[PDB]
Enzyme design. Structure first.
Site, PDB file in Angstrom:
ATOM      1  N   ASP A 153       0.768  -1.253   0.000  1.00 46.80           N
ATOM      2  CA  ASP A 153       0.000   0.000   0.000  1.00 46.80           C
ATOM      3  C   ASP A 153       0.799   1.304   0.000  1.00 46.80           C
ATOM      4  O   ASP A 153       0.210   2.374  -0.064  1.00 46.80           O
ATOM      5  CB  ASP A 153      -0.955   0.019   1.217  1.00 46.80           C
ATOM      6  CG  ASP A 153      -0.208   0.029   2.564  1.00 46.80           C
ATOM      7  OD1 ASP A 153       1.042  -0.015   2.594  1.00 46.80           O
ATOM      8  OD2 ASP A 153      -0.868   0.101   3.616  1.00 46.80           O
TER       9      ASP A 153
ATOM     10  N   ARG B 178       0.677   6.840   0.041  1.00 42.38           N
ATOM     11  CA  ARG B 178      -0.190   5.800   0.535  1.00 42.38           C
ATOM     12  C   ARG B 178      -1.311   5.688  -0.521  1.00 42.38           C
ATOM     13  O   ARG B 178      -1.970   6.679  -0.861  1.00 42.38           O
ATOM     14  CB  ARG B 178      -0.782   6.221   1.888  1.00 42.38           C
ATOM     15  CG  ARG B 178      -1.910   5.336   2.403  1.00 42.38           C
ATOM     16  CD  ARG B 178      -1.429   3.932   2.660  1.00 42.38           C
ATOM     17  NE  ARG B 178      -2.373   3.161   3.460  1.00 42.38           N
ATOM     18  CZ  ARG B 178      -3.356   2.416   2.961  1.00 42.38           C
ATOM     19  NH1 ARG B 178      -3.548   2.327   1.647  1.00 42.38           N
ATOM     20  NH2 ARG B 178      -4.135   1.720   3.786  1.00 42.38           N
TER      21      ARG B 178
ATOM     22  N   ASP C  87      -6.941  -1.258   1.386  1.00 45.95           N
ATOM     23  CA  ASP C  87      -6.223  -1.808   2.525  1.00 45.95           C
ATOM     24  C   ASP C  87      -5.683  -3.110   2.025  1.00 45.95           C
ATOM     25  O   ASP C  87      -6.435  -3.975   1.606  1.00 45.95           O
ATOM     26  CB  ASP C  87      -7.135  -2.099   3.705  1.00 45.95           C
ATOM     27  CG  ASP C  87      -7.597  -0.850   4.420  1.00 45.95           C
ATOM     28  OD1 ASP C  87      -6.938   0.213   4.326  1.00 45.95           O
ATOM     29  OD2 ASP C  87      -8.648  -0.941   5.084  1.00 45.95           O
ATOM     30  N   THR C  88      -4.374  -3.239   2.041  1.00 43.40           N
ATOM     31  CA  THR C  88      -3.739  -4.456   1.581  1.00 43.40           C
ATOM     32  C   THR C  88      -3.136  -5.174   2.761  1.00 43.40           C
ATOM     33  O   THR C  88      -2.920  -4.570   3.810  1.00 43.40           O
ATOM     34  CB  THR C  88      -2.547  -4.134   0.655  1.00 43.40           C
ATOM     35  OG1 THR C  88      -1.561  -3.381   1.386  1.00 43.40           O
ATOM     36  CG2 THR C  88      -2.993  -3.331  -0.537  1.00 43.40           C
TER      37      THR C  88
ATOM     38  N   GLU D 269      -0.325  -6.349   4.958  1.00 47.65           N
ATOM     39  CA  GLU D 269       0.976  -5.705   5.045  1.00 47.65           C
ATOM     40  C   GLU D 269       2.084  -6.632   5.527  1.00 47.65           C
ATOM     41  O   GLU D 269       1.813  -7.662   6.148  1.00 47.65           O
ATOM     42  CB  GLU D 269       0.903  -4.508   6.000  1.00 47.65           C
ATOM     43  CG  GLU D 269      -0.196  -3.490   5.714  1.00 47.65           C
ATOM     44  CD  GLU D 269      -0.296  -2.451   6.820  1.00 47.65           C
ATOM     45  OE1 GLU D 269       0.750  -1.889   7.210  1.00 47.65           O
ATOM     46  OE2 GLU D 269      -1.411  -2.211   7.322  1.00 47.65           O
TER      47      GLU D 269
ATOM     48  N   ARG E 162       2.174  11.246   4.489  1.00 46.55           N
ATOM     49  CA  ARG E 162       2.154  10.494   3.238  1.00 46.55           C
ATOM     50  C   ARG E 162       1.116  11.091   2.276  1.00 46.55           C
ATOM     51  O   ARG E 162      -0.003  11.431   2.687  1.00 46.55           O
ATOM     52  CB  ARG E 162       1.811   9.017   3.497  1.00 46.55           C
ATOM     53  CG  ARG E 162       2.788   8.294   4.403  1.00 46.55           C
ATOM     54  CD  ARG E 162       2.392   6.837   4.567  1.00 46.55           C
ATOM     55  NE  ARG E 162       1.153   6.672   5.328  1.00 46.55           N
ATOM     56  CZ  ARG E 162       0.584   5.497   5.602  1.00 46.55           C
ATOM     57  NH1 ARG E 162       1.129   4.359   5.171  1.00 46.55           N
ATOM     58  NH2 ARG E 162      -0.541   5.457   6.306  1.00 46.55           N
TER      59      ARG E 162
END
Length: 136
Positions: A16, A30, A35-36, A38, A82
């Site tokens: 992400d 970002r 939402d990946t 992580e 970010r």
């Protein structure tokens, strides 16, 4: 209207997050709305499919001829400084590619940064239907 802007890859950080040279200055981005799993989760570290999502993003950005960032209508940076954006590699949106491949879920949305929400939800529905990765 949202518009694309050129950037240059510096380094892929996680599924992400990617560091890019934007307007001559190094910055961490970002990926908006996704939402990946992580590999650098603050509490869990490496999650299931985290390495896969991470390699997918890395491959996508490293092999692109052109990288473009597209900010949405609201805040352009988060709490950690970010940049918040939709990232494109040769015209293909990395955010959508991850979701379409079942390597990310659509995140909790915060208006007005929800321009591509429907597109992403559509891709997620397809990935779920095809029982891809996260959904297998």
């Amino acid at each position: 209207k949202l518009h694309k802007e050129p950037a240059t890859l510096i380094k892929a950080i996680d599924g992400d997050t990617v560091k890019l040279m934007y307007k001559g200055q190094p910055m961490t981005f970002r990926l908006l709305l996704v939402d990946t799993p992580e590999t650098k989760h603050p509490k869990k570290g490496v999650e299931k499919y985290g390495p896969e999502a991470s390699a997918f993003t890395k491959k996508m950005v490293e092999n692109a001829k052109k990288i473009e960032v597209e900010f949405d209508k609201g805040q352009r940076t988060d709490k950690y400084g970010r940049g918040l954006a939709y990232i494109y590699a040769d015209g293909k949106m990395v955010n959508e590619a991850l979701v379409r491949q079942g390597l990310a879920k659509v995140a909790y949305v915060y208006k007005p940064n929800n321009t591509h929400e429907q597109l992403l939800r559509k891709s997620e529905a397809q990935a779920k239907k095809e029982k891809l990765n996260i959904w297998s």
